[PDB]
Amino acid sequence: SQQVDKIKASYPLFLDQDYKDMLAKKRDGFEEKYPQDKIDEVFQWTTTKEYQELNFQREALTVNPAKACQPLGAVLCALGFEKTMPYVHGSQGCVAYFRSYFNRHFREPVSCVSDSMTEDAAVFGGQQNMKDGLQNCKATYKPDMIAVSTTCMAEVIGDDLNAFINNSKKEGFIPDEFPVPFAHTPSFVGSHVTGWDNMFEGIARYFTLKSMDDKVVGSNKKINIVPGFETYLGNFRVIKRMLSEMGVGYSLLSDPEEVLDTPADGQFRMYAGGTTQEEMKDAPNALNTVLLQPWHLEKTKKFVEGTWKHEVPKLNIPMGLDWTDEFLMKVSEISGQPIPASLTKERGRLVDMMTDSHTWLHGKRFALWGDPDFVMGLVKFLLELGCEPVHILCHNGNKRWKKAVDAILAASPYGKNATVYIGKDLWHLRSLVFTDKPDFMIGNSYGKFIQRDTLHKGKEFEVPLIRIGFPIFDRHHLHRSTTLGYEGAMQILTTLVNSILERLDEETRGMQATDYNHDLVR
Amino acid sequence: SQQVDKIKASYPLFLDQDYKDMLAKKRDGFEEKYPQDKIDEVFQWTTTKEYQELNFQREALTVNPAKACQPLGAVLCALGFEKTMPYVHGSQGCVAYFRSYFNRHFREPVSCVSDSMTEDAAVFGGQQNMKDGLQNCKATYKPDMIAVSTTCMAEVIGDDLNAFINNSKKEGFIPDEFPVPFAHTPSFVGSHVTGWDNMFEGIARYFTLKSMDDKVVGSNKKINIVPGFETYLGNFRVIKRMLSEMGVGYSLLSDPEEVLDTPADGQFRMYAGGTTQEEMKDAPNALNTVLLQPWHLEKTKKFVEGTWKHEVPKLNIPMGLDWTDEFLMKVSEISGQPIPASLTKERGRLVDMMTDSHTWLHGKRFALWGDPDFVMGLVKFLLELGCEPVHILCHNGNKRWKKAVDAILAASPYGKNATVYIGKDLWHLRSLVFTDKPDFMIGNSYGKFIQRDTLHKGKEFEVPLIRIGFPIFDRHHLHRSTTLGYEGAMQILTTLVNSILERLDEETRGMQATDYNHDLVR
Amino acid sequence: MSREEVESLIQEVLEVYPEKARKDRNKHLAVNDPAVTQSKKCIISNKKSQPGLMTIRGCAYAGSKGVVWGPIKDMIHISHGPVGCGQYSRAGRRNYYIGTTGVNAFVTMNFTSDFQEKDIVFGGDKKLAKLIDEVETLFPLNKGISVQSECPIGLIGDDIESVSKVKGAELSKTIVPVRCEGFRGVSQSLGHHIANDAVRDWVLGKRDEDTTFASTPYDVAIIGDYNIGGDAWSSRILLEEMGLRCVAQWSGDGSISEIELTPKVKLNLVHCYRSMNYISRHMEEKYGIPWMEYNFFGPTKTIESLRAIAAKFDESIQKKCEEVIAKYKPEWEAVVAKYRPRLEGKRVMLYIGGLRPRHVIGAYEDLGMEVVGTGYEFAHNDDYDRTMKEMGDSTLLYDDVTGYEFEEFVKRIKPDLIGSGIKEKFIFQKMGIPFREMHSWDYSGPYHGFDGFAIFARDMDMTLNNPCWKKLQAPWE
Amino acid sequence: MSREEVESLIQEVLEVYPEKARKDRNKHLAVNDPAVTQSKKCIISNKKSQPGLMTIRGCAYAGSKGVVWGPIKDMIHISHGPVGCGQYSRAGRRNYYIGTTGVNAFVTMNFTSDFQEKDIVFGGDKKLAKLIDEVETLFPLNKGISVQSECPIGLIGDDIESVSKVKGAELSKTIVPVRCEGFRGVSQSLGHHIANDAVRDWVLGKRDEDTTFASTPYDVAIIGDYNIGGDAWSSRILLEEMGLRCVAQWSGDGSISEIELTPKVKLNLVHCYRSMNYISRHMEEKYGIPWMEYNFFGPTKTIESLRAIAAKFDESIQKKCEEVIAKYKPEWEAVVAKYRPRLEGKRVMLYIGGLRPRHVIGAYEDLGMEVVGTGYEFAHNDDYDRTMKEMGDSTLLYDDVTGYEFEEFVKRIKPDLIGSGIKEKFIFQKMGIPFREMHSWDYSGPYHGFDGFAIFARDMDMTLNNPCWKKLQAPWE
Ligand code: ICS
Ligand code: CLF
Ligand code: CLF
Ligand SMILES: [Fe+3]
Ligand SMILES: [Fe+3]
């Protein structure tokens, strides 16, 4: 039943008495559901340490992973170039999932095409699909460059990208001079950031491998900036703003910020901004190249050092005070441009907010997850705050990254109770936060279920979620935020301190029970 | 009892069994407390419509007001000028309260001095206090200008600021050339924004009343900007950035953004930035003058039109979509500078976020309070969102402003269930939100108590608080936010939509009871 | 109505493509004539998509894991292969259920085998067995395991049928292998077919020899309703207000015991023909269970469906049906009175998957809304046979439309409202045209039944009459 | 000792001021000599502030309304006058209480008369009577009304004493007029005096003829503890563990019945001498109740205070005192063992209005912290007489210090930690020196008692050893 003046959606419509009676009859009659006492017993068992010991002995099953496959990162890298179509050689369901997943995160149109390989290609390959797809895409969507990645289908069948594209060009399906870079992105190797790295290395190799003869290092007085897999527009904005305030010439390679933030003014822009082909062709003439996320840009680093002969600096991600300082000092050294007074003022303001919020931030315990560079930057920042990371988990991390994070933790007394986990999933983390309860989690939307589980154990056992990372599905416009630089550190500190204050207000809102500590001023 | 490894502050230390037994024994023995049933009965009575009818018949008592007194706004206006000391003629307790209150809001040092008038001054007046205080302040803190306001003490005794300052100058206590503007700021008239208006009008009259002979309107090709009482640094910053993007020459009179956001770099800067005396002296040569908050800048408008002969535009506060458009079009018309493409893109992006969050924002019911210009801008923006404000309350508003807000309401179908209240306090609003429950409140930190009361009636009756306005005490660094322009509209939309999503997640977190609607994607 | 203009637009849109793609896509575009009963003479469907034209279709894994098997709450579904698949399909579809997540319900979770290089090189049967043992260890109260294959499973020589048989015999557990590799078929429809075949082969016949379930002459099974936003629930109550008893619902909020009990019902009420007609026909062939289609979108179709369903039974059920009709008449009449005046005469274009494009038109017509163009991602010619008589004259029909084609059609026709998926939503919002998601329902709902009609009307009104759509043009331009 | 270095610093800081201000401020600055027990020969206090030197002092209204009367939870306190006063004083002081806010407790609320021009011109007695009637109407379970005057009340000739008498006789209600106008006195001290006089005149003696209260030889009254962050509670439990019975608690978490019952106790334990010695002496004179001062800041001072208090009763209370000491010894010993190594040898400067700048020293010394300088906003010469024996030789003393003076003192002395109010916090944080608010405890606490010592130690460690303080210098300067 619905009242026309106050219509109810599923919540709280299905909390009506008739619907509850219906659900009770259904469950008791035909679902053959386990008794509630058995369910409670099993849940309580799953919150225990013995269950955790069983859970961490897993070798074959993965529950609730925190990573994606390579072609997603390849598509994200491809979208960062001017009028470039992402072209994924393989099956179409992969492209449908990529498009929907980026649509839910960015809440923006995301363009990508497939060649729709089917059971026929499973024995013949995808030459015909490649030719027809390149011709159709070029004729229909009018792009300047087609950047080709692969699905696991073509990878297993061993489709030869270079041969396919060459045969497409020599038979007239696409013009010979037309830029078609390619990269193999196997989904059973690495993760989405590995796909980003492979795609960028492929594009760079396509544009500069065969024309190094006339290239002189440093002859354009610019700095190449490679961001890596990045789903915050504000990071691109802050890096450009910080470089521009310094008066430093720069080239931002694979810059997708415009195409993911087009205005709603009555027309659809499939392409917007991006890195030009001229910029990519001229990049080897730069003074040097900076990788913002070095721990998933290793193949790109090998190509840039081996071929462009750029002495790539050993820099961490510019997250937090010390690493932003190191990044800016390295830029000042390479370009010869002194650090301006505005940046000094901004750093002082960030320090001021730190000293203002330190009392509330001291000693708080955090579990957290995400991509390796983001995780290590967040851990360094939390150590700079006086906070205590305890469960540091990176599903797509490796052993060298683990060693570096351990070295970072050892340098601070606040990392004494911290453990770093690689290869583990969110179910492992659920066990970790049940058996050693922290104060808050920092992660993507998938953590919300974990919060639910903790709230089911009790209000005193609930671990609140803080949404920093990728993907963020159940909140709006958080992809506009910034985590890099002093501005990123400022927003992260504001978010953390205000989450702590909000939790404190929730805990002390009880009239005549806990509201003695419900202070007006905090 | 305390465990050294896990020390408890007052919450939850006083929830221990021994403390609970102590408190119960104290209450039962000596407090002579009313029985709990009577307390519950009286609270339930206070949540009723009959109690609301009794509450709105009040004529003499004010409970929990939402306004301050004039010298606070006078001090805020004074701090916006370069190396200027706020000097309040009267009693020192007022200065102590002003300093503490601004310190708690801005979390920054705030400088102001008193002349410490006592019963002796209550009998003979405060000439001697004025002379000694001006001499001492000038000799000690070395400011370029001393801006003088008054407390209710000197206002009641009728101290003459002009005569006191003149006698101070002619007797050599301070140099004759030394700028000492003054303004009467009676606390029993108007509110803090009235004090801001009086202080600014006094300063403008001091610097330009006697030198209008050689002034030519529009001869400096600039626009005077008068913001009014403003406690968001982001508003000053966004207005300056937006004017700079258009390539429009401007003068920002009473700009306190620097002195309230100084770096913490090892030294204390009592003064920083501000409007120069030269800028104030040259203001009458501008093309025109814009008041950002016209509804508390009426005396300033009268002075600027009557003396500077500037045709002040009839503009609302640039809040939301339509009013930002009108403000920028008026700026383009007055300066002759076309609106740039970056501003067009930003407006389109705000439109995009609006259409992205419209489904969740539609039909939500809001009760709000604050200063009149901020209130009406927020109301207009809420109409632009498809939202329904119901209780619009402005303690310091007037009747003409109420007619303006009613006219804005009638222009939209979404304001059909809205009522505007002037002269009412937060207890009236507590009754309003009990008897006609809205979805959320928008207001300052004082609203948190109201939320507490609603939560005491039940979880289904709780009205969540949204902290937009002044003062904000129980959260950190929210004074850095922005509410003006497209940027401010974007932040306001993000805050509203994510508060709605956060409440929805809270209501839907119960496992096997409501967690069926606990969606990953929203 | 302007019939000649429609095919002229089709030709001009066709012009851009190369000759092969143009000849292929020409057969998938049509002008509707309600007098035509055989759709094969006007439109072709269920064909491979053209490479590089940015189709909307999914894969067979989406049709099997994400659509049919996923809603089963008390079973654990293992995405067998690399990690991307189950991650992108995790909790993306609002298939609602009641249960304790992680203890007795596993819908919103992502179980996967997460292949690396070594699993591709040497196979993954041993790791599948080890994974099954680990699933048994850490999730004891599940009631069955399904193994949804991804592309490498079929590409390399894995044989999960034998592993499933051995592990099920060893553990006394129902383990269902599903060969739903993404490269099979052309869309999600073959995923539906494979899922139904697996269901008949490994689940349906468990209780064939069991007669302990007490049956009544009023036993029905809701087939092809996946409880999107609670849709199935809003249907079930009405059927139980008519005096019926629903043993099972497929498959939203569904349980394996309900599927096993399905062969004991007296009537199979099929909501989604396209995804469950296979098992409906199999049940009619093997158990003699009659099945009929029904429509619960809008008051008119709901009333007609209820009257037909009651006509399948005795007089008492018919009288209860009339009582239900009379009880719910004022509510939807009030909904129409409040919302019909604000949506009279507006025009809608729909592009949805296999059922809803023709199947929600009646609800729009109940609001005085005209559907001027509709299309399917993966439908068959029989769905179009129903569609043509459901739609009006000279309205546009289109199968497996491309993004370019659909954008051009929207630019020319200029509808007031567009209903499609998440991959079109922001494209057409930035064009200034109101958009409603027709899969997750813009994360609102339910829309089925009388209670869902009010929510449907409210959502359409709130999106189409939104004040945002009058503000996209800057006042200075 | 560097006593000459300190006097020279005093002179150089003195140099800036004009002659009159320099001559006055010279008497308020001093070098500590613990052998001197007559502070008047060394320092002057309780005088008017020099105009325009940015003093820290408040007003008499703050001393009466904000300090003494405000904590009384079951009474309603009306800020009589314009709106600013009670608004700026609302819920700024963490005086904790148990109650139902708005029903039986009214501490965090702002009741005011909110004068306009007409009230100033014609007076506000009629408005006061009407306000009292409205307060009775909308807050029936209140147990008394206080009327705190602001500056215009005394400047316009309002007679609230007669109105209070008439309305109290009419309504059978206790109405207390308090002439605490901000321009009386020089600071909050006269506010304390006026509030104590009002309490004596209108509240204390109501139950002088009432003998129904059953008394015990173990009856004490906690006077001058305002339950800052629960401070008073952390004291009371210890007194209850020693075998005492606490009738009343002035005035944090206090009730009017407790104040009325106070004249029946056997001993008055005064924590804040400065704000309540007046009523303590009055009660000794009138009722013969002895009163003694105690200190519960840190284990050493609280052990000494507990032993001294138990010495006032029989041997059973002494045995219970020793039991309490033995019970709490390991906890504060563990606190010392954990935190003393982190804070050995550091130096602190304090500036708090009365009593606390000297009572908190012992806790700092228990943490091995040296207090190298201390001062009061509004203390008297008796407070300095008690002070001078508790600080080190050649340590810095200063009364009603200005912002300039204190900034220069901090620059020259360079302390590791500074404890003062909100108006100094950010000033000295931007200078790179750790700061602790010693009025509100940086919104933490309590600090009184054994349980408060752990929190105090943790807070001092967390602020002084904060990694932020090593990062204010950017690496490129
Ligand atoms: S199953 Fe089918 S695409 Fe019949 S695969 Fe698809 S929850 Fe659609 S038009 Mo998403 S044949 Fe269901 C469908 Fe219809 S996922 Fe849902 S909305 S009624
Ligand atoms: S058509 Fe369908 S969704 Fe595509 S793979 Fe095939 S079953 Fe799966 Fe999962 S892992 Fe990633 S997304 Fe693919 S490329 Fe290898
Ligand atoms: S010394 Fe003390 S605080 Fe000052 S006024 Fe006097 S009692 Fe009060 Fe309230 S209203 Fe404002 S702040 Fe004053 S100027 Fe008139
Ligand atoms: Fe968008
Ligand atoms: Fe600050």
DSSP B248-280: --EEESS--TTTTS---SSS--S----B-HHHH
Report CA D26 to chain centroid distance, whole Å. 27
Q: Cβ-count burial of C123 within 10 angstroms (0-12 exposed, 13-18 middle, 19+ buried)?
A: middle
Q: Is C196 in the pocket of ligand 1 (CB under 6 A)?
A: no
Tokens (6 digits) for C261: 């009990």
| Nearest atom, ligand 3, residue D82 CA | 10
Host H or E run for residue C220: strand C219-225
Report CA A461 to chain centroid distance, whole Å. 29
Q: Contacts of residue D471 in chain A, CB cutoff 8 Å?
A: 321-322, 351, 354, 384
Host H or E run for residue C419: strand C417-420
Tokens (6 digits) for B222: 């600039």
CB atoms D429 and A522 under 8 Å? no
* Helices vs. strands in chain B: H and E counts, helices first: 21, 12
Tokens (6 digits) for B304: 């600027």
Minimal-distance CA residue to ligand 2 atom 13: A94
Q: Is C313 in the pocket of ligand 2 (CB under 6 A)?
A: no
A150 close to A90: Cβ distance less than 8 angstroms: yes
Å from CA of C361 to ligand 4 middle: 28
Cα–Cα dist A349/A339, whole Å: 16
User: At C270, phi and psi to the nearest 5?
Assistant: -95, 125
Bond into A340 cis (ω within 30)? no
Tokens (6 digits) for C29: 């575009």
Cα–Cα dist D125/D115, whole Å: 11
Residues 6+ apart with CB under 8 A from D473: B265, B266
Q: Nearest ligand, CA of residue B95? A: 3
Contacts of residues B211-217 at CB distance under 8 Å and 24 or more positions apart, as own/partner, are B211/B281, B212/B284, B212/B307, B212/B308, B215/B284, B215/B285, B215/B308, B216/B285, B217/B284, B217/B285, B217/B286, B217/B287, B217/B308, B217/B309, B217/B310
Phi-psi region of C144 (alpha: psi -120 to 50; beta: other; left: phi over 0): left
Instruction: Classify domain C60-202 by CATH number.
Output: 3.40.50.1980
The letter for the amino acid at B406 is: D
Look at residues D435, D416, D438 and name the one whose alpha carbon lies nearest to residue D357: D438
Q: Nearest ligand, CA of residue D153? A: 3
**Residue C439 labeled ligand binder:** yes
Distances in whole angstroms, Cα of residue D427 to Cα of each of B144, C341, D348? 21, 64, 16
What 3-state DSSP class applies to A56?
A: coil
- Residue of A332, A387, A519 to mutate, interface with D, max D Cβ within 10 Å: A519
Look at residues A471, B352, A110, A100 and name the one whose alpha carbon lies nearest to residue C421: A100
Phi-psi region of B195 (alpha: psi -120 to 50; beta: other; left: phi over 0): alpha
CB atoms C475 and B332 under 8 Å? no
| Nearest atom, ligand 3, residue B72 CA | 11
A67 close to C83: Cβ distance less than 8 angstroms: yes
**Residue B69 labeled ligand binder:** yes
| Nearest atom, ligand 3, residue B91 CA | 1
Cα–Cα dist D70/D77, whole Å: 7
Cα–Cα dist A436/A444, whole Å: 21
Q: Cβ-count burial of A5 within 10 angstroms (0-12 exposed, 13-18 middle, 19+ buried)?
A: exposed
Q: Contacts of residue B261 in chain A, CB cutoff 8 Å?
A: 349
Q: Contacts of residue A457 in chain C, CB cutoff 8 Å?
A: none
Å from CA of B261 to ligand 5 middle: 7
CATH numbers and ranges of domains, chain A: 69-214 (3.40.50.1980), 215-319 (3.40.50.1980), 320-363+484-522 (1.20.89.10), 364-469 (3.40.50.1980)
Cα–Cα dist B311/B333, whole Å: 13
Q: Is C228 in the pocket of ligand 1 (CB under 6 A)?
A: yes
Query: Does CATH number 3.20.20.370 belong to domain C1-59+342-476?
Result: no
B152 is catalytic: yes
D271 close to D452: Cβ distance less than 8 angstroms: no
Q: Cβ-count burial of C348 within 10 angstroms (0-12 exposed, 13-18 middle, 19+ buried)?
A: buried
Bond into D446 cis (ω within 30)? yes
CB atoms A30 and C255 under 8 Å? yes
Half-sphere exposure of D274 (CA within 13 A, CB side): 30
CB atoms A122 and C183 under 8 Å? yes
The letter for the amino acid at A319 is: M
Q: How far is B113 from chain C (nearest CA, A)?
A: 48
CB atoms B13 and D237 under 8 Å? no
Tokens (6 digits) for D383: 């407070």
Total number of residues shown for chain A? 522
Say what the resolution is, in angstroms.
2.2
Cα–Cα dist C357/C377, whole Å: 10
What one-character DSSP code corresponds to residue C271?
Answer: S
The letter for the amino acid at A320 is: G
Compute chain D's Rg from CA coordinates. 23
Angle, to 10 degrees, between the axis of helix C449-464 and the axis of helix B341-361?
160
Angle, to 10 degrees, between the axis of helix D422-429 and the axis of helix B92-106?
50
Host H or E run for residue B74: helix B70-78
Residue extents of the structural domains in chain D: 1-59+342-476, 60-202, 203-317
The letter for the amino acid at A179 is: P
DSSP assignments along A429-487, one per residue:
HHHHHHHS--SEEEE-TTHHHHHHHHHHH-GGG---EEE-SS---SSSSGGG---SHHH
Sign of CA dihedral C123, C126, C132, C134: negative
Chains in touch with B (3+ beta-carbon pairs under 8 Å) read A, C, D
Cα–Cα dist B432/B11, whole Å: 32
Cα–Cα dist D325/D318, whole Å: 10
Q: Contacts of residue A516 in chain D, CB cutoff 8 Å?
A: 96-98, 230
Q: Contacts of residue B15 in chain A, CB cutoff 8 Å?
A: 514
Distances in whole angstroms, Cα of residue A152 to Cα of each of A66, A89, A94, C117, C268? 19, 9, 9, 11, 40
What one-character DSSP code corresponds to residue B296?
Answer: G
Bond into C446 cis (ω within 30)? yes
Calculate the dihedral angle through the C-alpha atoms of B74, B76, B80, B83, rounding to the nearest 10 degrees. Answer: 80
Q: Is C458 in the pocket of ligand 1 (CB under 6 A)?
A: no
Chains in touch with D (3+ beta-carbon pairs under 8 Å) read A, B
Pick the residue from chain A with its C-alpha nearest to B497: A476
Structure method: cryo-EM
D278 close to D98: Cβ distance less than 8 angstroms: no
CB atoms A15 and B514 under 8 Å? yes
The letter for the amino acid at B187 is: S
Place of tokens 């179409």: A92
Å from CA of B358 to ligand 4 middle: 12
Compute chain C's Rg from CA coordinates. 23
A281 close to A387: Cβ distance less than 8 angstroms: no
Q: Is D63 in the pocket of ligand 3 (CB under 6 A)?
A: no
**Residue C59 labeled ligand binder:** yes
CB atoms within 10 A of CB C139: 20
Strand extents, DSSP E, B17-75: 62-63
Tokens (6 digits) for A88: 């994924």
CB atoms C468 and B351 under 8 Å? yes
What 3-state DSSP class applies to C148?
A: strand
CB atoms A351 and D472 under 8 Å? yes
Q: Is C226 in the pocket of ligand 1 (CB under 6 A)?
A: yes
Q: Choosing from B75, B113, B148, B152, which is the catalytic residue?
A: B152
- The secondary structure of chain D, three-state, reads CCHHHHHHHHHHHHCCCCHHHHHHHHCCEEECCCCCCCHHHCCCCCCCCCCCCCCCCCCHHHHHHHHHHCCCCCCEEEEECCCHHHHHCCCCCCECCCCCECCCECCCCCEECCCCHHHHHHCCHHHHHHHHHHHHHHCCCCCCEEEEECHHHHHCCCCHHHHHHHHHHHHCCCEEEECCCCCCCCCHHHHHHHHHHHHHHHCCCCCCCCCCCCCCCCEEEEEEECCECCHHHHHHHHHHHCCCEEEEEEECCCCHHHHHHHHHCCEEEECCHHHHHHHHHHHHHHHCCCEEECCCCCHHHHHHHHHHHHCCCCHHHHHHHHHHHHHHHHHHHHHHHHHHHHHCCCEEEECCCCCHHHHCHHHHHHCCCEEEEEEECCCCHHHHHHHCCCCCCCCEEEECCCHHHHHHHHHHHCCCEEEECHHHHHHHHCCCCCEEECCCHHHCCCCCHHHHHHHHHHHHHHHHCCHHHHCCCCCCC
Q: Cβ-count burial of B211 within 10 angstroms (0-12 exposed, 13-18 middle, 19+ buried)?
A: exposed
Å from CA of A153 to ligand 2 middle: 8
Residue-wise burial string across D357-396, b where 16 or more C-beta atoms lie within 10 A, e elsewhere: bbbbbbbbbbbebbbbbbbbbbbbbebbebbbebbeebbb
Calculate the dihedral angle through the C-alpha atoms of C384, C385, C390, C392, rounding to the nearest 10 degrees. Answer: 80
Cα–Cα dist C79/C147, whole Å: 6
Q: Which residues neighbour ligand 5 (ion) by CB within 5 Å? A: A 352, 356; B 107-108
Residues of A marked as catalytic: 152, 156
CB atoms within 10 A of CB D126: 12
Instruction: Classify domain C203-317 by CATH number.
Output: 3.40.50.1980
Pick the residue from chain B with its C-alpha nearest to C433: B355
Cα–Cα dist D177/D162, whole Å: 9
Q: Contacts of residue A91 in chain C, CB cutoff 8 Å?
A: 59, 151, 182-183
